[PDB]
Structure 1
Amino acid sequence: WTRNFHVLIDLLNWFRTTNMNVNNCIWALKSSLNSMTNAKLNVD
C-alpha cells in the first residue's frame, strides 16, 4: 500500500481544523450576552 505518508493527511487535517475554527466563535457570542447582563442595572 505504501507505493509521502505524512503529506497526504495534513491537508485534510487542516480542512478539519478550519471547520472547528468556524464553530468556535458562536459559543463566545453566546457568552458575551451573559456577560452583558451583569453590567446592566424601574425606580419605585
Structure 2
Amino acid sequence: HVLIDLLNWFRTTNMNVNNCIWALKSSLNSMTNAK
C-alpha cells in the first residue's frame, strides 16, 4: 500500500496538473472572444 499510496498520490497530482493546463487553454479560448 505504501508504494500504492505514493503511486496514486503522484498520479492524482499528474492529472490535476494536466486538468489545470486544459482549463487554462479552455479559459483562453473562451476569453479570446472578449478580447
TM-score band by shorter chain is 0.5 to 0.7
CA shift at 1:35, angstroms?
1.6
TM-score normalised by structure 1 residue count: 0.51
Largest Rg, 1 or 2? 1
**Residue 22 of structure 2 corresponds to which residue in structure 1?**
27
Cα distance, 1:8–1:31 mapped onto 2, change above 3 Å: closer
RMSD: 1.9
Runs of 4 or more, structure 1, over 4 Å off, are none
Higher helix share: 2
TM-score normalised by structure 2 residue count: 0.54
% identity of equivalent residues? 100
Structure 2 unmatched ranges of 5 or more: none
How many residues are paired up? 35
